[PDB]
Design a protein around this ligand. Sequence first.
Ligand code: NA
Ligand code: NA
Length: 342
Amino acid sequence: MSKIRVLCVDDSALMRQIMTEIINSHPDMEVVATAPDPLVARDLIKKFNPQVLTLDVEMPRMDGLDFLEKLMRLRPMPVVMVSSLTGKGSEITLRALELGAIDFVTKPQLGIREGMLAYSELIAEKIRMAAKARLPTKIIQHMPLLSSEKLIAIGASTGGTEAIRHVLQPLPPTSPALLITQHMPPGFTKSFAERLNKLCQITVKEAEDGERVLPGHAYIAPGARHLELARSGANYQVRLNDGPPVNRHRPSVDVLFRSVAQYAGRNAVGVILTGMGNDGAAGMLELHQAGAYTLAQNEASCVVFGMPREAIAMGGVDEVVDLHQVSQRMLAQISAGQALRI
Ligand code: NA
Ligand code: NA
């Protein structure tokens, strides 16, 4: 088929040429135009009709988030953000994801050759995804507080920051603990957790090694460690694992799902959400085999139907569900395994 038409917006002249070199070197994509700011990009989008836009967050003289707001409103298209591994970049990137950008990449040190080739392969991966991606609050009432043995595990990748936000926002304070692994670099996961916390009735935080796993709390995996459930005596604990990535994933959804299958078993509900790849598929099968009920986000609501698809294909998914029914289905399911207290 034809090459993917990419438009790159970046304030740095060197980056605009770097992106040109990277993207054009791949045979299934090409840079049809570059632009240093949102104004020049506007007319180039109309002239060259790109399929994918890469957008650097830090543009000095203007405001790129309002460009992204207007773009997603009047001409929505796949947008991949390019961010710096900084706190200011993390806040702007998450806000970009709220406005409708589907994914983002962090710039490594491109002065080192291996950082340039890793960035190159990552940029090509996001562009191929973005060309096919689908582009995208009542509090649930009368939820009883269940046993602290009850737990929900959630995994996500591309589109997962918005999917997770839609699932957590209506959760009442009596919701069981949630362990959440979202593919994300270190640092970003802290700002991610902090923004979700301000939007949620439950407490959302980045998971800390050794802390007890409490009802009404969601624990976000840190960007540089595997998040696992562990059992310290009688009580659930967070365990952060600095072991190696598994198929280039740390935190890994598979690792989380397996640890939950092991230490929670039938007292858990597993949820696999939008994202590319197969992370979570094999762990969800262990969860299923341990007696946990498992849900997978359906294709019509996924930005990328990759991770739920692979989980389904592995045979460990009980139920496919639209994103906007996930909150109710997972609460109802985990509640059904809870005997009366009264
Ligand atoms: Na090319
Ligand atoms: Na909160």
